[PDB]
């Protein structure tokens, strides 16, 4: 079992089968409380909550008095990361008998949507309650669940309202990947690739080599019993952990994005601008993949990044089934009639939280695994437009 | 020009005439930014924002590139502390040209409503922006503005959702009191009295000695534009400062209310339960005054507080024009047909943020200026019912 520390605390426990046999117990011993609220959507719930309710009663039978478990299920989709859902969830908790108090321990069981949402609710519930992350997707395991960033979407853009609330525990259970849809898995690989590109050429090269093997396992059939990733697990764990460990480091050194944390946003300046236009038809990771390509092209444009690097980024993202341009085949049919104007994209980048005033900040890599600055660089509009 | 230090920083500056000739300048020097957002209601705005716009341009004229000042006027009343107003202010900020970014400095110009609201918006705007407090009401000057506690109301109770976001600066300008309605001033005295009752019998005695004088300066009939509190200001400043300084201390020693900070909630366990029923017809301070009386009666019931003390708290609150019972004359006609059932009050105390699980907690004074515990004490329902 791997333990990664973040911000002076060992909130990260990684292993296989945690959900089934560890989270239930650990929660009741390290997160003493009379109330526990489980948040997840209908898809993840029907598959994973049942087993937990039992694991819960079992470990709560021994504690006096016995705490309680309350399960909230919301409509799966990047459409629940909103004000209304966060409102219903809060009201719901408040209507409970007895109500859910400041000792409430909230459990985020899901990907980035449920994670971002659950964590935000927890940050403002009665001004703050404890919560834990149980990332069930790849993207949430290698990125979203770590770091304490949470938020919701408003009609204008992505993650415009939120809070930096660190979760008390973060349980990374690789077993969840067994049931994660193919698209989702690829989608999350965008983040893994991104994390490697800003940290080490070694890790990136590793990811390039793992391509075929990893991709062949994800597409595999699997019969009720054996686990996909049969014979590729050591590789998987190694890659996932590398991503998680690096994020932990960055977050530790600059929790509130005073500068260094900007780097975790590589590909997101353009990615988010695009995502605000093509969501929900297009997933986060898929948009970020295209954003990494355009931001990379921008770095070459500025004479910061070498062309050979731009091509290698594209080839790597392509090798994982990720799109590398807004003209991509799949992405074309999925939008149906949606297209990004250079104007809209520029309008949305004005909304980039990294911006310092009206100065747009984008992460520029000077080379694979080597950022240009230890923060986002100020870039002029005209230069952005050229790659759009 | 007095300065108080809170949570390791002298963010509190108190004097007369700060708004007119200081806030403007200090903001531009200590809160460097390209964007400043002023939030206030129509009542306080028409009286106080004009003078500031001028003071602003004046001190921003030397600054290049020119920074901007955007203004948001919400409707007066507790009605503004809602999920919607917070969503309106937010969608507004996000909609300016260019959008309000993470360098935005938000200015809270108002009492507890505008303070709690503005501060909460700031806490979650793009995950957190800077903000300052310009308390225009007595209550806010002596309590709500200091401490970082911010929140909004939901159909179920008071301050159920919010955040602990410390303001960068807190400007206490006594000049605002000149135009504060009589009811408001009295309303805030409830907090002053409360702060003294949990800190010192000395301060609490000077309060008793100043009732006649303070209240006479307050009730005096004046024409628009002329002042009061003439020949009593040294007294006023002294009392206000004492309350602010004490809150500063408490908040510093237990920022996120884990223990100590419970004491600042004396009279609020019952006060909030009542306020959730009689609002908005009844003001916070007026509800807290009745809450202090009943909580004190409760302390005597438990054999913690001496009867002579309870009858001194009553006499003091009465001396300020504050109610001491739900049967009060003014409070009877103001509710019109509203009355608090004992079962209802109990229900509303279930939602009290201080409760450890289902265990209601209340602040018990063992004597004037001396709490029973350095935190809220656990009290049984049956004992609460007896003072209801
Ligand atoms: N372990 C899992 N197995 C099955 N369905 C899952 C799993 N993880 C999440 N899902 C479903 O996958 C979809 C995408 O997850 P989401 O949290 O929105 O994305 P991400 O984590 O990529 O931000 C959702 O419809 C959700 O219900
Ligand atoms: N100094 C002032 N002069 C004029 N009206 C004021 C002043 N301060 C605020 N007000 C008005 O006082 C009322 C009560 O203030 P509010 O912030 O709602 O409560 P409090 O500060 O007592 O919690 C509001 O209607 C507001 O518009
Ligand atoms: O700081 C972080 O953890 C992130 O940059 C945070 C972003 C979301 P944000 O740009 O809204 O902060 C997330 O999508 C990215 O994968 C990681
Ligand atoms: O801790 C505080 O600052 C307070 O207890 C905060 C409360 C509001 P809360 O009980 O909703 O936290 C306020 O009414 C009181 O005067 C002071
Ligand atoms: Cl919110
Ligand atoms: Zn991302
Ligand atoms: Zn109060």
Curated annotation (Swiss-Prot), chains A, B:
It is found in: Cytoplasm. It comes from the Eukaryota. The active site is at residues 257, 272. Zn(2+) binds at residues 191, 268, 284. NAD(+) binds at residues 41-43, 78-81, 111-113, 116, 136-137, 158, 176-179, 187. Disulfide bonds: none annotated. Residues 1-381 are annotated as: 3-dehydroquinate synthase. 7-phospho-2-dehydro-3-deoxy-D-arabino-heptonate binds at residues 127, 143, 149, 159, 191-194, 247, 261-265, 268, 284, 353. Homodimer. In the N-terminal section; belongs to the sugar phosphate cyclases superfamily. Dehydroquinate synthase family. The AROM polypeptide catalyzes 5 consecutive enzymatic reactions in prechorismate polyaromatic amino acid biosynthesis. This is Pentafunctional AROM polypeptide. It comes from Emericella nidulans (strain FGSC A4 / ATCC 38163 / CBS 112.46 / NRRL 194 / M139). The gene is aromA.
